[PDB]
Design an enzyme around this catalytic site. Structure first.
Site, PDB file in Angstrom:
ATOM      1  N   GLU A  50       6.293   5.062  -2.415  1.00 20.53           N
ATOM      2  CA  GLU A  50       7.303   4.002  -2.405  1.00 20.53           C
ATOM      3  C   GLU A  50       8.721   4.534  -2.588  1.00 20.53           C
ATOM      4  OE1 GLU A  50       6.712   0.549  -4.987  1.00 20.53           O
ATOM      5  OE2 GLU A  50       4.545   0.676  -4.628  1.00 20.53           O
ATOM      6  N   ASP A  98       7.422   8.917  -9.467  1.00 25.87           N
ATOM      7  CA  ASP A  98       7.680   8.978  -8.050  1.00 25.87           C
ATOM      8  C   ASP A  98       6.354   8.873  -7.335  1.00 25.87           C
ATOM      9  OD1 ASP A  98      10.467   9.233  -7.321  1.00 25.87           O
ATOM     10  OD2 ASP A  98      10.439  11.160  -8.379  1.00 25.87           O
ATOM     11  N   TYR A 141       3.125  11.229   4.023  1.00 25.79           N
ATOM     12  CA  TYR A 141       3.018  12.201   2.947  1.00 25.79           C
ATOM     13  C   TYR A 141       3.544  13.561   3.373  1.00 25.79           C
ATOM     14  CZ  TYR A 141       0.678   8.927  -0.067  1.00 25.79           C
ATOM     15  OH  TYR A 141       0.411   7.833  -0.856  1.00 25.79           O
ATOM     16  N   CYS A 188      -7.096 -19.043  -9.108  1.00 29.50           N
ATOM     17  CA  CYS A 188      -7.919 -17.852  -8.959  1.00 29.50           C
ATOM     18  C   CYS A 188      -9.242 -18.244  -8.308  1.00 29.50           C
ATOM     19  CB  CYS A 188      -8.202 -17.229 -10.326  1.00 29.50           C
ATOM     20  SG  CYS A 188      -9.461 -15.926 -10.297  1.00 29.50           S
ATOM     21  N   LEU A 198      -9.976   1.962  -0.940  1.00 26.26           N
ATOM     22  CA  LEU A 198      -9.102   0.802  -1.042  1.00 26.26           C
ATOM     23  C   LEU A 198      -9.609  -0.392  -0.223  1.00 26.26           C
ATOM     24  CD1 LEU A 198      -5.228   0.985  -0.795  1.00 26.26           C
ATOM     25  CD2 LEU A 198      -6.545  -0.756   0.457  1.00 26.26           C
ATOM     26  N   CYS A 237     -12.704 -12.143 -12.251  1.00 25.82           N
ATOM     27  CA  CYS A 237     -11.554 -12.220 -13.150  1.00 25.82           C
ATOM     28  C   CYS A 237     -11.927 -12.780 -14.513  1.00 25.82           C
ATOM     29  CB  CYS A 237     -10.447 -13.068 -12.527  1.00 25.82           C
ATOM     30  SG  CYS A 237      -9.796 -12.369 -11.000  1.00 25.82           S
ATOM     31  N   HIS A 282       7.330  -3.438  -5.396  1.00 27.21           N
ATOM     32  CA  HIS A 282       6.389  -3.667  -4.302  1.00 27.21           C
ATOM     33  C   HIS A 282       6.211  -5.178  -4.186  1.00 27.21           C
ATOM     34  CE1 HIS A 282       2.852  -3.547  -1.751  1.00 27.21           C
ATOM     35  NE2 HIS A 282       2.817  -2.227  -1.773  1.00 27.21           N
ATOM     36  N   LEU A 341      -9.214  -6.435  -4.347  1.00 24.87           N
ATOM     37  CA  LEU A 341      -7.931  -6.224  -3.705  1.00 24.87           C
ATOM     38  C   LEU A 341      -7.831  -7.088  -2.460  1.00 24.87           C
ATOM     39  CD1 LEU A 341      -5.320  -4.662  -3.744  1.00 24.87           C
ATOM     40  CD2 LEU A 341      -6.428  -2.905  -2.353  1.00 24.87           C
ATOM     41  N   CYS A 343      -2.694  -9.219 -10.477  1.00 23.08           N
ATOM     42  CA  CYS A 343      -4.144  -9.211 -10.413  1.00 23.08           C
ATOM     43  C   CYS A 343      -4.573  -8.165  -9.391  1.00 23.08           C
ATOM     44  CB  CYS A 343      -4.645 -10.592 -10.005  1.00 23.08           C
ATOM     45  SG  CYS A 343      -4.012 -11.896 -11.087  1.00 23.08           S
ATOM     46  N   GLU A 375       9.432   5.631   1.438  1.00 25.56           N
ATOM     47  CA  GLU A 375      10.023   4.351   1.802  1.00 25.56           C
ATOM     48  C   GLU A 375      11.497   4.210   1.436  1.00 25.56           C
ATOM     49  OE1 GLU A 375       7.821   0.953   0.468  1.00 25.56           O
ATOM     50  OE2 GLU A 375       9.010  -0.431   1.692  1.00 25.56           O
ATOM     51  N   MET A 386      -3.256   3.020  -9.437  1.00 23.42           N
ATOM     52  CA  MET A 386      -3.963   3.070  -8.163  1.00 23.42           C
ATOM     53  C   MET A 386      -4.167   4.521  -7.746  1.00 23.42           C
ATOM     54  SD  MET A 386      -3.053   1.393  -4.444  1.00 23.42           S
ATOM     55  CE  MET A 386      -1.722   2.506  -4.019  1.00 23.42           C
ATOM     56  N   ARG A 441      -7.614   4.167  -9.289  1.00 17.92           N
ATOM     57  CA  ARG A 441      -8.439   3.201  -8.600  1.00 17.92           C
ATOM     58  C   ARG A 441      -9.090   3.750  -7.330  1.00 17.92           C
ATOM     59  NH1 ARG A 441      -4.992   0.162 -10.141  1.00 17.92           N
ATOM     60  NH2 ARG A 441      -3.953  -0.676  -8.268  1.00 17.92           N
ATOM     61  N   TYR A 442      -8.309   4.435  -6.496  1.00 13.15           N
ATOM     62  CA  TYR A 442      -8.829   4.924  -5.221  1.00 13.15           C
ATOM     63  C   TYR A 442      -8.850   6.431  -4.921  1.00 13.15           C
ATOM     64  CZ  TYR A 442      -7.960  -0.071  -4.814  1.00 13.15           C
ATOM     65  OH  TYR A 442      -7.913  -1.423  -5.059  1.00 13.15           O
TER      66      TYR A 442
HETATM   67  C1  LIG Z   1      -1.135  -6.178  -0.429  1.00 13.91           C
HETATM   68  C2  LIG Z   1      -1.895  -5.452  -1.496  1.00 13.91           C
HETATM   69  C3  LIG Z   1      -1.675  -6.259  -2.768  1.00 13.91           C
HETATM   70  C4  LIG Z   1      -2.208  -7.681  -2.535  1.00 13.91           C
HETATM   71  C5  LIG Z   1      -2.096  -8.644  -3.676  1.00 13.91           C
HETATM   72  O1  LIG Z   1      -0.907  -8.990  -3.957  1.00 13.91           O
HETATM   73  O2  LIG Z   1      -3.111  -9.050  -4.258  1.00 13.91           O
HETATM   74  C6  LIG Z   1      -1.431  -3.987  -1.586  1.00 13.91           C
HETATM   75  C7  LIG Z   1      -2.212  -3.190  -2.661  1.00 13.91           C
HETATM   76  C8  LIG Z   1      -2.348  -1.724  -2.144  1.00 13.91           C
HETATM   77  C9  LIG Z   1      -1.613  -1.740  -0.792  1.00 13.91           C
HETATM   78  C10 LIG Z   1      -2.014  -0.719   0.291  1.00 13.91           C
HETATM   79  C11 LIG Z   1      -1.882   0.738  -0.242  1.00 13.91           C
HETATM   80  O3  LIG Z   1      -0.598   1.022  -0.714  1.00 13.91           O
HETATM   81  C12 LIG Z   1      -2.265   1.735   0.863  1.00 13.91           C
HETATM   82  C13 LIG Z   1      -1.518   1.530   2.196  1.00 13.91           C
HETATM   83  C14 LIG Z   1      -0.027   1.926   2.122  1.00 13.91           C
HETATM   84  C15 LIG Z   1       0.717   1.734   3.437  1.00 13.91           C
HETATM   85  O4  LIG Z   1       2.092   2.097   3.324  1.00 13.91           O
HETATM   86  C16 LIG Z   1       0.617   0.273   3.870  1.00 13.91           C
HETATM   87  C17 LIG Z   1      -0.855  -0.057   3.995  1.00 13.91           C
HETATM   88  C18 LIG Z   1      -1.648   0.069   2.684  1.00 13.91           C
HETATM   89  C19 LIG Z   1      -3.118  -0.251   3.060  1.00 13.91           C
HETATM   90  C20 LIG Z   1      -1.170  -0.912   1.569  1.00 13.91           C
HETATM   91  C21 LIG Z   1      -1.282  -2.371   2.021  1.00 13.91           C
HETATM   92  C22 LIG Z   1      -0.839  -3.381   0.914  1.00 13.91           C
HETATM   93  O5  LIG Z   1       0.520  -3.215   0.602  1.00 13.91           O
HETATM   94  C23 LIG Z   1      -1.762  -3.195  -0.297  1.00 13.91           C
HETATM   95  C24 LIG Z   1      -3.207  -3.495   0.118  1.00 13.91           C
HETATM   96  S1  FES Z   2      -6.625 -13.694  -8.968  1.00 16.19           S
HETATM   97 FE1  FES Z   2      -5.397 -13.792 -10.851  1.00 16.19          FE
HETATM   98  S2  FES Z   2      -6.852 -14.095 -12.503  1.00 16.19           S
HETATM   99 FE2  FES Z   2      -8.087 -14.007 -10.644  1.00 16.19          FE
END
Ligand SMILES: C[C@H](CCC(=O)O)[C@H]1CC[C@H]2[C@@H]3[C@H](O)C[C@@H]4C[C@H](O)CC[C@]4(C)[C@H]3C[C@H](O)[C@]12C
Ligand code: FES
Ligand SMILES: C[C@H](CCC(=O)O)[C@H]1CC[C@H]2[C@@H]3[C@H](O)C[C@@H]4C[C@H](O)CC[C@]4(C)[C@H]3C[C@H](O)[C@]12C
Ligand SMILES: C[C@H](CCC(=O)O)[C@H]1CC[C@H]2[C@@H]3[C@H](O)C[C@@H]4C[C@H](O)CC[C@]4(C)[C@H]3C[C@H](O)[C@]12C
Ligand SMILES: C[C@H](CCC(=O)O)[C@H]1CC[C@H]2[C@@H]3[C@H](O)C[C@@H]4C[C@H](O)CC[C@]4(C)[C@H]3C[C@H](O)[C@]12C
Ligand SMILES: C[C@H](CCC(=O)O)[C@H]1CC[C@H]2[C@@H]3[C@H](O)C[C@@H]4C[C@H](O)CC[C@]4(C)[C@H]3C[C@H](O)[C@]12C
Ligand SMILES: C[C@H](CCC(=O)O)[C@H]1CC[C@H]2[C@@H]3[C@H](O)C[C@@H]4C[C@H](O)CC[C@]4(C)[C@H]3C[C@H](O)[C@]12C
Ligand code: FES
EC number: 4.98.1.1
Lengths: 359, 359
Positions: free
Chosen positions: B279, B276, B59, B342, B28, B347, B199, B34, B132, B283, B12, B100-101
Site C-alpha cells: 500500500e 511499510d 512487488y 452481520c 486469500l 462472527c 485501505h 473475507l 471484520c 500504491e 494479513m 493470515r495468508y
Molecule cells: C476487499 C477486501 C476487504 C473486504 C471487506 O471490507 O470485508 C480486501 C481484503 C484483502 C484485499 C486483497 C489483498 O490485498 C490481495 C490483492 C491486492 C491487490 O492489489 C488487489 C487485489 C487483492 C485480491 C485485494 C482485494 C481487496 O482489496 C481485498 C480482498
Molecule cells: S461481519 Fe461484522 S461482526 Fe460479522
C-alpha cells in the site's frame, strides 16, 4: 447600550407551523449549493407542492410544527447572558437566528445585524460537524448576501464553522446517554447497544470529500471514551431518501438487524444535531421506535434526550464563542481546504470571504 | 526460562518473495470470512493464478517482496524486551507472528504457542482500527483452528482487538507527520494539505455495520488534535478494485482533484497500518506520488514514514499488552457487538470464544 457583538446562529431550520411547510421546501429546492434540477425554477415550486402534504402530516404527528426556533432562542439567550460576563470587552452580545430555509432567513438576520450597527459578527454554525451541505450552505448564504446586495460588510466577520469535539458538547451527550441508560430496566442496562445516529449523505457527496462523516465519527469516539466504553456501539445514518446510494448502515435497517440478531435493547443517540426536530421527534421516535421497533419485537428502545435547553449546552456555546474571540480565529484551518473534488465555484469564494476578513 | 505469556501478532501479511505471491493469493481467495465466491474451491486457484503476474510485478517494483515480516519481527522483539521489564509477573514473554495468508500462518503460530506450553495467549491484532475483514478475519481463524482441531485450548486466551486512539500510536503518527512536513520547502509548509489514507472497504461491507470507517476517523481526529490543526486535511481511501461501490473519496482521485484546484503540496499519511507494505511502497509511492502526481503537475508530494522500527511504537505495543494484562480484559466492549447486519455465523462464535474464556 447598543449591541457590539452579534452571534449569528446558523441552522437549516424547520417549519414552525404546517402553514410554513410549503415555503420551507420551496426555498430548499431553489438552492443550488445543495441541489441542481432541470428547469429548477419550475420544478422547485412543483416538488415543494407535491411533498407538502406528506411533510405537513409528519409535523402534525409531532404536534404541529418544528421546535427548532424555540430551542435555538433558548440556547441563544443563555449563551448571550454568559458571553456578557465572560467577555465584557466585546459586550453587549446579541444573538441572531439565521435559518437557511425558513424565517428568520440568513439574509434577514444579516440585514438586522448590519442595521444594528454591530462592530463584530460571528457566523456560528449550529452543526457541530461540518458538511458542505449544512454549515457550508449557510456560510455561502453570507457570502452571497453581500455579493448580491453589492456592498461590503459594515461589521468584522469571522466564523466558528465546526466544533465536533468541544469538551462541553461531548459532556452533554455523555450526560444525556447516561441518564437514558438509567431509564432502561436494570436487568437490561448492560445489554443495551448504542446506535449513534446522524443524518446520512448521498455517497456522491461523501465521495467528493465532504468533511462530515469523519467529524461525526470523531464526536462518537469522544463520547464513548468519556463513557468509558460502558456499552457497545455503532455509528449509523438516518434520513436517506430516494433510490441513490447513501452512506450506511441505515439507522432503520440497523435497528431491525439488531433485533433479528438478539440485541433487543437499543439506545438511539442523535449525534449530529443539538435540538429536537423532525429527525428525532418523528423519524426516530415514531417511525423507528414506535412502528418499526414494535414490528421487530424490540424489548426496549429509547432515545437520548436532545441537548435542547440543557444549561451545560448554553455553556458550551458561550465557551466556543469566547474562545473564538480570544484566539482572533477567522475560521477553522479545515475551512481553508475545500473538498478535493469540489465542483461548486462558490465554496472558494465563501472560504476567501472569511479568510480575508479584516482583523 | 520457558515462555509464560505469548503475544500473537496478527496481520494479513504479504509475500516475502515473488515466488510467494501465488499461494498468498490462493489462501486469500479461499477465506470465507473475507469473501464468498461461487464454486470457490475452483475459482480461488484460478483467480490466484491470473493475478499472480501483475502482483509479482508490483512487488518487483518495490524491490522484490514485502517487508511486513521484517518490520513485524523488529516490533515484536522490541515489544517483548519491554514487556519482560514491564510485567515481571507474566514473563518470560514471547511474540509469535500469525499472518493470515503467508507463513508463518495463524494456525502454525497457534500450534507453536500450544507446543511451548504457554499459560496465557493474547491475540494482538496489528490493525489499530477494527474491520471484520481484517482483525475479525484473524480472530475467526483462531476460533476455527480449535473448532477444526477438535480440541479446546491449553492456554488462556484474550484479545486486543482494536486500539484506534492509543496515545502512543497517535504520538508516533504525529511525530512522523511533523518530520515529513519539515522535508517540504519551508515556503510551502503552511500550504501543505494532509491526506490521511486508509485501505478502503466496499460499501456492502460498510453498510452492514463494519466498525472500521468510524475508528479510522477517530485516529485521524486524535492525530490532528495533537498536531494542533497545523494544516488542513481530509481522510480519503485507497486500494479500491473492481467495479463495485467502495467508500470514497479515493486517494488517487483526491490527489488529482487537489492539484487541479491549486493545492499542489500534499502530504500522504497512511493512517490504518503500522509498517511499510505494498500500500505504501507501491500504491502511494510509485502509483500516486511518482506517476499520477507528476502527470497532475504536483509541486511537492511526500509520504509520512511508516511507523516501522520507531522505538516509541514498540513502546505503544508493550503498553497495550501491559494494560490489557492488568485490566484482565478478554476483549473490547466493541467486540461484544457484531455488525447489525452481520450474515457470517462464525462472527458470533468467535466473539463467544473470547468473551467466554476462563479468567
Ligand atoms: C476487499 C477486501 C476487504 C473486504 C471487506 O471490507 O470485508 C480486501 C481484503 C484483502 C484485499 C486483497 C489483498 O490485498 C490481495 C490483492 C491486492 C491487490 O492489489 C488487489 C487485489 C487483492 C485480491 C485485494 C482485494 C481487496 O482489496 C481485498 C480482498
Ligand atoms: S461481519 Fe461484522 S461482526 Fe460479522
Ligand atoms: C432528474 C432529477 C435528478 C437529477 C440528478 O440529481 O442527477 C430528478 C430530481 C427530482 C425528480 C422529480 C421528482 O421526483 C418529482 C417528479 C417524479 C416523477 O416520477 C417524475 C417527474 C418528477 C418531476 C421528477 C423528475 C426528475 O426525475 C427529477 C427532477
Ligand atoms: C441530501 C441533502 C444533503 C446533500 C449533501 O450531502 O450535500 C439533504 C439536505 C436537506 C434535505 C431535505 C430537507 O430535510 C427537507 C426534506 C425532508 C424530508 O423528510 C425528505 C426530503 C427533504 C427534501 C430532504 C432531502 C435531503 O435529505 C436533503 C436535501
Ligand atoms: C425525494 C425527493 C422527491 C420527492 C417527490 O418526487 O415527491 C427528491 C427531490 C430532489 C431529490 C434530491 C436531488 O436530486 C439532489 C440529490 C441527488 C442525489 O443523487 C441523491 C440525493 C439528493 C439530495 C436527492 C434526494 C431526493 O431524491 C430528492 C430530495
Ligand atoms: C459473481 C461473483 C460475485 C458474487 C457476489 O458478490 O454476489 C464474482 C466474484 C469474482 C468474479 C470472477 C473474477 O472476476 C474472475 C473472472 C473474471 C472474468 O471477467 C469473468 C469470470 C470470473 C471467474 C468472475 C466471475 C464472477 O463475476 C465472480 C465469481
Ligand atoms: C479484482 C478481483 C478479480 C481480478 C481478476 O480476476 O482479474 C476480484 C476477485 C474477487 C473480488 C472480490 C469479491 O467479489 C468479494 C467482494 C465483492 C464486493 O462486491 C466488492 C469487493 C470484493 C472484495 C471483490 C473485490 C474484487 O472485485 C475481487 C478481489
Ligand atoms: S463541495 Fe465541499 S468545499 Fe465545495
Amino acid at each position: 447600550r447598543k449591541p457590539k457583538t452579534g452571534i449569528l446562529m446558523l441552522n437549516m431550520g424547520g417549519p414552525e407551523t404546517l402553514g410554513d411547510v410549503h415555503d420551507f421546501l420551496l426555498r430548499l429546492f431553489l438552492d443550488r449549493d445543495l441541489m441542481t434540477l432541470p428547469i429548477q425554477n419550475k420544478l422547485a415550486p412543483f416538488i415543494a407542492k407535491r411533498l407538502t402534504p406528506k411533510i405537513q402530516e409528519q409535523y402534525r404527528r409531532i404536534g404541529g410544527g418544528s421546535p427548532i426556533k424555540i430551542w435555538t432562542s433558548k440556547q441563544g439567550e443563555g449563551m448571550v447572558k454568559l458571553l456578557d460576563e465572560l467577555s465584557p470587552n466585546t459586550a453587549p452580545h446579541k444573538y441572531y437566528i439565521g435559518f437557511r430555509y425558513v424565517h428568520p432567513l440568513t439574509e434577514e438576520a444579516i440585514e438586522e445585524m448590519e442595521r444594528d450597527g454591530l462592530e463584530r459578527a460571528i457566523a456560528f454554525t449550529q452543526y457541530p460537524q461540518y458538511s458542505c451541505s449544512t454549515t457550508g450552505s449557510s456560510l455561502n448564504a453570507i457570502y452571497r448576501y453581500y455579493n448580491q446586495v453589492g456592498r461590503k460588510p459594515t461589521m468584522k466577520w469571522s466564523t466558528i464553522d465546526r466544533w465536533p469535539t468541544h469538551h462541553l458538547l461531548i459532556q452533554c451527550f455523555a450526560d444525556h446517554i447516561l441518564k437514558e441508560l438509567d431509564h432502561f430496566p436494570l436487568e437490561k442496562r448492560s445489554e443495551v447497544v448504542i446506535l449513534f445516529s446522524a443524518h446520512s449523505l448521498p455517497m456522491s457527496v461523501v465521495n467528493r470529500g465532504d468533511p462530515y462523516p469523519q467529524e461525526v465519527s470523531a464526536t462518537v469516539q469522544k463520547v464513548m471514551e468519556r463513557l468509558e466504553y460502558c456499552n457497545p456501539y455503532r455509528l449509523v445514518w438516518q434520513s436517506k431518501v430516494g433510490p441513490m446510494p447513501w452512506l450506511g448502515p441505515q439507522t432503520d435497517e440497523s435497528i431491525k438487524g439488531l433485533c433479528e440478531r438478539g440485541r433487543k435493547n437499543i439506545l438511539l443517540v442523535p449525534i449530529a444535531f443539538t435540538s429536537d426536530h423532525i429527525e428525532t421527534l418523528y423519524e426516530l421516535d415514531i417511525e423507528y421506535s414506535q412502528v418499526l421497533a414494535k414490528e421487530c419485537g424490540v424489548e426496549n428502545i429509547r432515545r437520548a434526550e436532545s441537548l435542547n435547553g440543557n444549561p451545560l449546552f448554553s455553556k458550551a456555546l458561550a465557551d466556543l464563542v469566547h474562545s473564538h474571540i480570544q484566539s482572533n480565529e477567522l475560521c477553522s484551518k479545515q475551512l481553508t481546504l475545500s473538498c478535493p473534488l469540489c465542483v461548486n465555484p462558490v465554496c472558494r469564494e465563501t472560504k476567501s470571504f472569511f479568510t480575508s476578513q479584516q482583523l
